[PDB]
Amino acid sequence: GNLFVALYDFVASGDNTLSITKGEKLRVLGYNHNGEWCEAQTKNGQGWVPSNYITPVNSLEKHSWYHGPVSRNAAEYLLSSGINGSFLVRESESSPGQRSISLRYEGRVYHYRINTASDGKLYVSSESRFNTLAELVHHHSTVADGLITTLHYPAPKRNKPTVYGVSPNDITMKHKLGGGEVYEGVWKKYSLTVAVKTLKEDTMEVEEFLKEAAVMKEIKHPNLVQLLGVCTREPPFYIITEFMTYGNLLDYLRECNRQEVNAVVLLYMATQISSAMEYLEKKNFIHRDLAARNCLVGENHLVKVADFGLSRLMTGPIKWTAPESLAYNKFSIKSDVWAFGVLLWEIATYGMSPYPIDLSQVYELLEKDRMERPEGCPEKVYELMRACWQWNPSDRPSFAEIHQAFETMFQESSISDEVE
Ligand SMILES: O=C(Nc1ccc(OC(F)(F)Cl)cc1)c1cnc(N2CC[C@@H](O)C2)c(-c2ccn[nH]2)c1
Ligand SMILES: COc1cc2ncnc(Nc3ccc(Oc4ccccc4)cc3)c2cc1OC
Ligand SMILES: [Cl-]
């Protein structure tokens, strides 16, 4: 009804950004070039606001139980911390317009489809159809009516929506890491915590460091780290990226509390990384340094991938390479598929050192037959990483194929159930 409602809290602290509290009423006056920001007027003032942080009043997103387009296993992770009656309504990522209800009950997560009849009345069971989705959700929150339990408690959001650009349109240096290249720091103009990477050369050339970053600036995916800025005017070049509070994926995995980080969490991270790699491959970009250290962990196990196009740097890296990448200097997605298979072995092993096996002869060890089953790794997952390690690179599945497998691997089961 011409009005908008804020879905997430946003602190302004920006050029002309407007602070919004969840549930505030907004009148939208316009949008910026990319649409990631929109000018809004509220009872307090006028200013720019992230577009994904607010939704139209007539929108179905105004409801808490509607999480928009959500992966099936992402929804399963969302319901992992729930109780009986915990539920969410999601849009199918593979085919949009298809709606599903994910409902948690006694440790299980059940998925139901909201099918539309010839009348257009959406329904879950054929005996009760409704004109609108809100009617159906209200009815199934009143009685179960064919569901295993009533839709009682909408699931909370996993993370705030990702925005591209700190503004609609060198600086403070904090502590580095501790040791045992990348520093944490503050941007004053927007007063936000960022990560700054310094570098020397070899891969970081004179004109490549600027023309390559232009392609990197166009890297925009929820599971890919965002290149906020670059500073090439000083002998130490600065790479400004988002900040992830939990840091290294390998360090997280080795120190994590496995009761909180269970098999569903592991598949959530794997699906995130696979979707990031699918986005990178579909754009014809090669990561080249895929591994656990180059991934980062965020809130609610939000995983992002960094160090893409980095190739060199840090280095204080043999086992994550393709057999054809170090023998003949290959540049391909399939090498990244091999690195992804090693990464998934690491995830299945909770961060164990790969090939645990003489390094000085590992190449040969591969000319004939690869790591064995981790304890509890489902045979499907080992099969996937097995395909990811092929002597001929053409025989390895695409990252899109890997993601499609991952989503449909446990359609009639649970990864927690299929541990053994
Ligand atoms: O959950 C586990 N694996 C998993 C989860 C999700 C997967 O799918 C994906 F998609 F997420 Cl990769 C794939 C694998 C798991 C549980 N327990 C384990 N332990 C055995 C020794 C004991 O102390 C603890 C191990 C293990 C074996 C070797 N090291 N660790 C693994
Ligand atoms: C809490 O601990 C950490 C938090 C982090 N938060 C964000 N980023 C990190 N690492 C990073 C930063 C910039 C960078 O530069 C590039 C970015 C993309 C592509 C190429 C280069 C590479 C890695 C972090 C590292 C951390 O400890 C290892
Ligand atoms: Cl929306």
Author numbering: 82 to 250, 260 to 270, 274 to 409, 421 to 460, 462 to 474, 476 to 526
Task: Tell me, in the authors' exact words, what the paper reports.
Double-drugging via active and allosteric sites is a recently developed approach to overcome these obstacles. Herein, we provide the quantitative framework for double-drugging using two targets: Aurora A kinase (AurA) and Abl. Both kinases participate in various cellular pathways, and their dysregulation results in a multitude of cancers, such as breast cancer and leukemia. We find that both orthosteric and allosteric ligands exhibit preferred binding to the active or inactive states and that cooperativity occurs by shifting this active–inactive conformational equilibrium through long-range allosteric networks that are encoded for natural regulation of those kinases.
Intrigued by the synergistic effect of SKI and asciminib on Abl activity, we structurally characterized this ternary complex by cocrystallization, resulting in a 2.86 Å crystal structure of Abl64–510-SKI-asciminib [inactive, DFGin, BLBplus (29, 30)]. First, we note that the entire N-terminal lobe is ~30° twisted only for Abl64–510-SKI-asciminib, when aligned by the regulatory domains. Second, the α-C helix is adopting the “out” position resulting from this N-lobe twist, since an α-C helix “in position” would clash with strands β4 and β5. In consequence, the canonical salt bridge between K290 and E305, a hallmark of an active kinase, is broken in our structure, whereas D400 (DFG-motif) is positioned in the “in” position. We note, that the orthosteric site is fully occupied by SKI and the twisted N-lobe aids in forming this tightly packed binding pocket. In fact, K290 located on β3 strand is wrapping over SKI burying the inhibitor in Abl’s orthosteric site. Besides extensive van der Waals interactions between SKI and Abl, the quinazoline ring of SKI shares two hydrogen bonds with Abl, one between the side chain hydroxyl of T334 on β-strand 5 and N-2 of SKI as well as between the amide of M337 and N-0 of SKI. When compared to other closed Abl structures, we find an extended domain interface between SH3, linker, and N-lobe of the kinase domain, which explains the positive cooperativity between SKI and asciminib. Moreover, S248 (located on the linker) forms a hydrogen bond with D96 in the SH3 domain, which is only present in the ternary complex of Abl64–510-SKI-asciminib. We conclude that our complex of Abl64–510-SKI-asciminib represents the only example of a fully closed and inactive Abl structure.
